[PDB]
Structures are given as structure tokens and as C-alpha cells.
């Protein structure tokens, strides 16, 4: 009665592009070209696929299958599998809030850059502005110029002193106050995601049509543009030059594993929610396969889109694209690439489509990012929730805005690094390992192959059973152990993070998954009788 069965998706292509749009984001565009260039060049293509075939694809497919089979949220699905691990469904929620605290602000920057890209003369071309210093030296000026340790470029000046305004803060210690411009930008973004989420999967399935197809068009325009630029072969050479001695280093394998894990994004509850709304007899294998393989291919061509332009930039300057692509962060897009676009014909066009591309790269992923949590909460508190969806979605968008006010400060970029590298990563990897173990070693892999055999009509191959049993948990275990054994020393804009930053990162990191052990203790302490009977009634799913 009343609700009973849940709703279903409006078309196969909508869900196929929704998952693709969530999988593809900023990092696919710029993190993969950098990590591919600095870790063996073209030879990075070899371990990147292995970590996919053995690690990424099995987690992606197993998550999309569990989601499309059980049709439950990230929280209520554990009550029907392993109640003690229900805290997982909560942990991810908290995790999402941290991601949403910064991932949108980044887009805000692009948005503030987009609304600043409608002028006939781009603001970051000249030095006669209200934010430039006396060190600002630009081009279209007297030739012979020689760069100095204190000299700066109008683009670097525009990012540093105008939009980001990071010169007004001394670090994590002093970062206040808040920039109202980026607050309004992130409000507009939280509004464009509000009207794209508030109705449920109908609008995020209609809006995804645009958010997921535009980046390929923009990447195509930038691609055929950058291929025509003189001296673009240098960036391609630096992008594909095989350096097989890097493969001897045990670091590049960990870099590839981590990169393909985030980029694929299993273990977050997004694929669970997206798979939940679908036909029971609908095929899941082909969907997961195609989407992931596209997500990789798209990264691969994005590499060219970036390195052709950076090759042209190295030609205009003096070569060694590694020198011009030293900084691995937002500065590679907001300063370097932007300065390269400004020196091209129809600069307004390629700027509008570039920043618009960035925003459209981000939107689909935060759409999903919220979609998983909303689905989880609505499925965990039914009839206490779902009274309206707009109320909860609004409470989340607003919560993310107040959670992003720390990032909208002058030293907000500092917090972005802190949140992006020390907090979300190791916790998502941790909960992904816990989930992979619970589904593989608690619920039983044989019964899982039986559920896929019921849904798809055939039992999964031995390659996948042997992947879920041993290969995938060791795949996540390797990354977690590698990170925990040596957290990277953070540095951003000639500013090294204090030594206690990692403690703050761990505090944010630890505060996310306090619920899974405290919930195991909660259910283990609430259910009467012996601990063996409590863990037996707590590990085995509900019989009816």
C-alpha cells in the first residue's frame, strides 16, 4: 500500500550518461594528464589499465549490480545485508559533506571566471588593473624582458590577488574573511543543482543530457584548436614519451591505482543510487563496461586537449613542458591554460567554452554526489521522510553552502587542498575496503553470483569471482597502506602547510568514520544475549 514499489528511470541512455557524467569530472581532465606525464609518460598507460581490469572495473560492476538488484539506499541496504555495517551508510554521508564543502567552491572559481569572460579584453591579459602589483609584467610589452624571482604574470596575478584573493590570508591560521563574490557564485551553482535535483532523478536525468555531453564538445573544439597551434607536438611528446624506468618505481603503481579509483568512483553510494532506479531485468554488465571504458578514453583524449595547448605554451616560452606544468593543481587550469587561451584568436569564445566546460564538468558529479546521500536518507527514514523531497534537498544544498563558507574565505584554496588530500581520500578508500569485504566475505560471493545469476540470467565468470574474492580488497588495501605509511607533504603557492595540518586532516578524516565502529558497538551493545548470538543475528541478513 501507499508507496510500496519504488519508481524507475525514464530511458536507458539517461542512466548511461548519468553514470558517465558522474564518473567524468575535473580530475579526469587535468589530474590524469599530469599524473600520466610525470609517471613514465606513455608507459603510464600500462599499469593504469591493469589497476582498472583488476581493481576498478570489478568494484564498479559489483557496486552497480548491488544497487540495481537490492534497490535500497546507502543506509537501508545494510539492514538487509549486515546490520552492524549500517554505519557505513552514515559515514559516506559525512564524507559527502566534506567533498561538497570544497568541490563546488572550485566550480565557483570557474563560474566567477566565466562571468568575467564576457569582456572584449580579458581581465588577465593586461597589468593595468586594481589588483596587480608593481611586479606585474605582461606580454604585448617591450621585448627582451627577463623574468625575476619576484616578477609575476597578469594571469597569476588575476587568480592570486583577484578571484582567489589568497594574498589577504597568511595560511590556515589566518584565512578570514569570506569573499562575497565566490559566495554568490557558489549560491548560483547550488541553485542550478537545486533545480536539477529537487524533483528527483527526473531532472538530474534531463539536465545530465546537457551536463554530460557538453564537455565532449568543448574538449573537441579545444582539441582541434590546440592541434592547429604551432609547436604543439612538444606537449604531445612529453605526454606520450615512454619512460619505462619509472615503472620500476613502486610509486607510479600506487598513483595509477588511486587515480583510477577516484576517477571510477566506486564505494561512494552514487552508483548504488543510480543503479537503484532501473529495470530489474535490465542488463548491468554492458552498462558498467561501456561507461568505464568511455571514462578512461575521455581522460585519454583530454590529455591531448591539455598537452597540445601546453606544448604551444612551451613553444611560446622555451620548452620542457614539465617546467611549464610543474604545479599540479587548480593553477594548471586557472593560470597556465588560461594564459595560453588569452593569446589565441577568438579568445573570448575559447574562454567562455573553457570555463563553461569546467562548470559542466563539475555539475554532473555534484548532482550525483548529492543524489546518493539523498537516496540513502530517504530510504533509511521512510514515511518519517519523503513527505517532500524538495525539503530535504533544500536542507542539503543549504547545508553545503554553510559548509562551504570556510572555503569561500581568502585562504579558501588552502582549505581545499587540506580537504581534498588529507580528509576525503583515505576515508573513502577505507569505507570502500570495508564495503568490498562485507559484500565479498560476509554476504558471500557465491550468493552474490547467484543474485547476478538471477538478475542477468547467468552467473558471473570465474575472472570476476576471483577478482571480488582477493584482487579487489588487496587493490584497495594497497592504496590505504601506501597513503597511511607516508602522507604527502602539502605545499601550495610558495606556502608549506604547517606540521600539524595532518592532524587536522586526520581529525576531519577520523570524524567521518566514527559511526561505523561506534555503530557496530551500538548494535552489538543493544541486541541482547551472548556476543556470539548477537554477532550471528547481526551478520546474517533478515530472514523474511
Amino acid at each position, epitope marked *: 500500500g501507499s508507496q510500496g514499489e519504488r519508481e524507475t528511470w525514464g530511458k536507458k541512455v539517461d542512466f548511461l550518461l548519468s553514470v558517465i557524467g558522474y564518473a567524468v569530472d575535473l580530475g579526469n581532465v587535468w589530474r590524469f594528464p599530469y599524473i600520466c606525464a610525470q609517471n613514465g609518460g606513455g608507459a603510464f598507460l600500462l599499469p593504469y589499465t591493469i589497476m582498472a581490469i583488476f581493481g576498478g572495473i570489478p568494484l564498479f560492476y559489483m557496486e552497480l549490480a548491488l544497487g540495481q538488484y537490492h534497490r535500497n539506499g546507502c543506509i537501508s541496504i545494510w539492514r538487509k545485508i549486515c546490520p552492524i555495517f549500517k554505519g557505513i551508510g552514515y559515514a559516506i554521508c559525512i564524507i559527502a559533506f566534506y567533498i561538497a564543502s570544497y568541490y563546488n567552491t572550485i566550480m565557483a572559481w570557474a563560474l566567477y571566471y566565466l562571468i568575467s569572460s564576457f569582456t572584449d579584453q580579458l581581465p588577465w591579459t593586461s597589468c593595468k588593473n586594481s589588483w596587480n602589483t608593481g611586479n606585474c609584467t605582461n606580454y604585448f610589452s617591450e621585448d627582451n624582458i627577463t623574468w*625575476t624571482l619576484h616578477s609575476t604574470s597578469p594571469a597569476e596575478e588575476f587568480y592570486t590577488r583577484h578571484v582567489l584573493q589568497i594574498h589577504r590570508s597568511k595560511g590556515l591560521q589566518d584565512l578570514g574573511g569570506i569573499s562575497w563574490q565566490l559566495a554568490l557564485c557558489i549560491m548560483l551553482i547550488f541553485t542550478v543543482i537545486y533545480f536539477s535535483i529537487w524533483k528527483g532523478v527526473k531532472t538530474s536525468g534531463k539536465v545530465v543530457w546537457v551536463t554530460a555531453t557538453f564537455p565532449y564538445i568543448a574538449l573537441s573544439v579545444l582539441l582541434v584548436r590546440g592541434a592547429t597551434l604551432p609547436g604543439a607536438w612538444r606537449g604531445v611528446l612529453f605526454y606520450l614519451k615512454p619512460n619505462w624506468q619509472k615503472l620500476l618505481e613502486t610509486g607510479v603503481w600506487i598513483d595509477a591505482a588511486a587515480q583510477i579509483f577516484f576517477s571510477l568512483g566506486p564505494g561512494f553510494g552514487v552508483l548504488l543510487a543510480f543503479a537503484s532506479y532501473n529495470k530489474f531485468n535490465n542488463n548491468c554488465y554492458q552498462d558498467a563496461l561501456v561507461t568505464s571504458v568511455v571514462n578512461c578514453m575521455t581522460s585519454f583524449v583530454s590529455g591531448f586537449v591539455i598537452f597540445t595547448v601546453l606544448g604551444y605554451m612551451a613553444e611560446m616560452r*622555451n*620548452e620542457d613542458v614539465s617546467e611549464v606544468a610543474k604545479d599540479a593543481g587548480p593553477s594548471l587550469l586557472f593560470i597556465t591554460y588560461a594564459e595560453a587561451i588569452a593569446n589565441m584568436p577568438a579568445s573570448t569564445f575559447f574562454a567562455i567554452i573553457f570555463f563553461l566546460m569546467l562548470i559542466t564538468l563539475g555539475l554532473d558529479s555534484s548532482f550525483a554526489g548529492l543524489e546518493g546521500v539523498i537516496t540513502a536518507v530517504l530510504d533509511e527514514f521512510p514515511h518519517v521522510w519523503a513527505k517532500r523531497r524538495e525539503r530535504f534537498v533544500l536542507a542539503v544544498v543549504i547545508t553545503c553552502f554553510f559548509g562551504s563558507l570556510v572555503t569561500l574565505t581568502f585562504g579558501g584554496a588552502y582549505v581545499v587542498k587540506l580537504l581534498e588530500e588529507y580528509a576525503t581520500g583515505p576515508a573513502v578508500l577505507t569505507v570502500a575496503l570495508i564495503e568490498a569485504v562485507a559484500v565479498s566475505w560476509f554476504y558471500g560471493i557465491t550468493q552474490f553470483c547467484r543474485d547476478v545469476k538471477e538478475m542477468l540470467g547467468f552467473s558471473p565468470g570465474w575472472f570476476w569471482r576471483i577478482c571480488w574474492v582477493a584482487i579487489s580488497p588487496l587493490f584497495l588495501l594497497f592504496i590505504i597502506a601506501s597513503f597511511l605509511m607516508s602522507p604527502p607533504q602539502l605545499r601550495l603557492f610558495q606556502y608549506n602547510y604547517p606540521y600539524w595540518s595532518i592532524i587536522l586532516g586526520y581529525a576531519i578524516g577520523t570524524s567521518s568514520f566514527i559511526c561505523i565502529p561506534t555503530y557496530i558497538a551500538y548494535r552489538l551493545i543493544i541486541t541482547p544475549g551472548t556476543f556470539k548470538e548477537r554477532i550471528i543475528k547481526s551478520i546474517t541478513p533478515e530472514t523474511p
Partner: antibody, heavy 119, light 108 residues
């Protein structure tokens, strides 16, 4: 004008260490990278590494990693290079030369330091 | 790394003749080549930077040409005080390497 005055010649026994100074004048010391070029007897020039005077931002060569240590002092605008584990190959003339960030040319050099590693 | 190869270790010329020294690089360099002059007993002195551009305080008789991998340093009127060892050096990729050196001996 722009003058880079190094230290005098040094005769040191093999296995010891030696430090060479580089007093700069005639320009804004905090504006340019400070470099060190090794020139062997009858050989070509060999860039050892540079250092950023503002914070001591060193950048050595893979061939000199663990061989040379570059330091800098802003209070007196003077650079230093220390060499440990001295052998017969280190007996050469060392220069310290000023250089901008881009284009990376060596506009002004020091007079040189004749190093002799022998017992 | 980059290998700056000066094939001619020694070159003979006369006072007033046109002399040109060649410099061969490993990979493509665009226009990132500097020419230094080291007189016997003195420190190297920068003459050319970025292939063709002359530095301040350098006579007009010293020129530079080339665009790619092979570069040429040209002296129009050789003087008696031009007797020195000439070095070429790339300034694009880390590390910065030098050439073998061409001791320009004067024939009379």
C-alpha cells in the same frame, strides 16, 4: 658594477670538505638565482646547481646530488658551496654565476676558485 | 639530459676574416641557445642569449643564428683580442649543459 667576489685558492687533503664563498654586489641580491659552475682542467663547463636567495631554494644536478651543498645568506648577500668526499676529480676551478629565471643565462660570473685536492 | 656537441675542438682564422662556430644539440631547442666567451685566464663572459640576441656590453661584431638543433655563432671582423675559448649552452631543459668548447686560434 655587478661584482661577484669568490674566495681564494684552496689546497685540501682527499676525504675532507671545503666551502667556497661568493660575495655579490652591484645588483638586487634577492632578484636573481645564484648558480655554481664547475670547470675541470682542460674540460668544459659543468653546471652544478642553483639556489634561490630568498629562501635557499636549492636545485642540484643528479650528478652532484649528495656531492655539493649550496647555501645562501641574505644578511650579507653571500652564497656558499660546500664539497664533501673530495677526490682527485674535484681539483678544478669553480665559479659562482648570477642568473635570472628566464631566459636562464649566466650574465655575471665570479673570478673563480682554484681547488687542489692532494695530500 | 642534453648533449651540446661542438665537433670542431680547434678552428683557425685570421684577423679580419669571417669565422663561424657550430653547436649541435641532442633534441630540438627552438631558440634557447646561449654563447659564452672564456679568455685564457678569465671567467666565462656571456655574449649571446636566445640564439641571436646580444647581451648589453657586447660589440656588434658578434652575431648568432640558428633555429632548431644546429646553431651558429658568427664573428665578422676577428681581432687580436678575440683569442679565447667559446662555449655554447642550452637554457631550456633542466639541467643546463654546455658544449665541448672551440679554442679559436689565430693564423698569421
Amino acid at each position: 658594477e655587478v661584482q661577484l667576489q669568490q674566495s681564494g685558492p684552496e689546497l685540501v687533503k682527499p676525504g675532507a670538505s671545503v666551502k667556497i664563498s661568493c660575495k655579490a654586489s652591484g645588483y638586487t641580491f634577492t632578484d636573481y638565482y645564484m648558480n655554481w659552475v664547475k670547470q675541470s682542467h682542460g674540460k668544459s663547463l659543468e653546471w652544478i646547481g642553483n639556489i634561490n636567495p630568498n629562501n635557499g631554494g636549492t636545485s642540484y644536478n643528479q650528478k652532484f646530488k649528495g656531492k655539493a651543498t649550496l647555501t645562501v645568506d641574505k644578511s650579507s648577500t653571500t652564497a656558499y658551496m660546500e664539497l664533501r668526499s673530495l677526490t682527485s676529480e674535484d681539483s678544478a676551478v669553480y665559479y659562482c654565476t648570477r642568473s635570472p629565471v628566464r631566459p636562464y643565462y649566466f650574465d655575471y660570473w665570479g673570478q673563480g676558485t682554484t681547488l687542489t685536492v692532494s695530500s | 639530459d642534453i648533449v651540446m656537441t661542438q665537433s670542431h675542438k680547434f678552428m683557425s682564422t685570421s684577423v679580419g676574416d669571417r669565422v663561424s662556430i657550430t653547436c649541435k644539440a641532442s633534441q630540438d631547442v627552438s631558440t634557447a641557445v646561449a654563447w659564452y666567451q672564456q679568455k685564457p685566464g678569465q671567467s666565462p663572459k656571456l655574449l649571446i642569449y636566445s640564439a641571436s640576441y646580444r647581451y648589453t656590453g657586447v660589440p656588434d661584431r658578434f652575431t648568432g643564428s640558428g633555429s632548431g638543433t644546429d646553431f651558429t655563432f658568427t664573428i665578422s671582423s676577428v681581432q687580436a683580442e678575440d683569442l679565447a675559448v667559446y662555449y655554447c649552452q642550452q637554457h631550456y631543459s633542466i639541467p643546463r649543459t654546455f658544449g665541448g668548447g672551440t679554442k679559436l686560434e689565430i693564423k698569421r
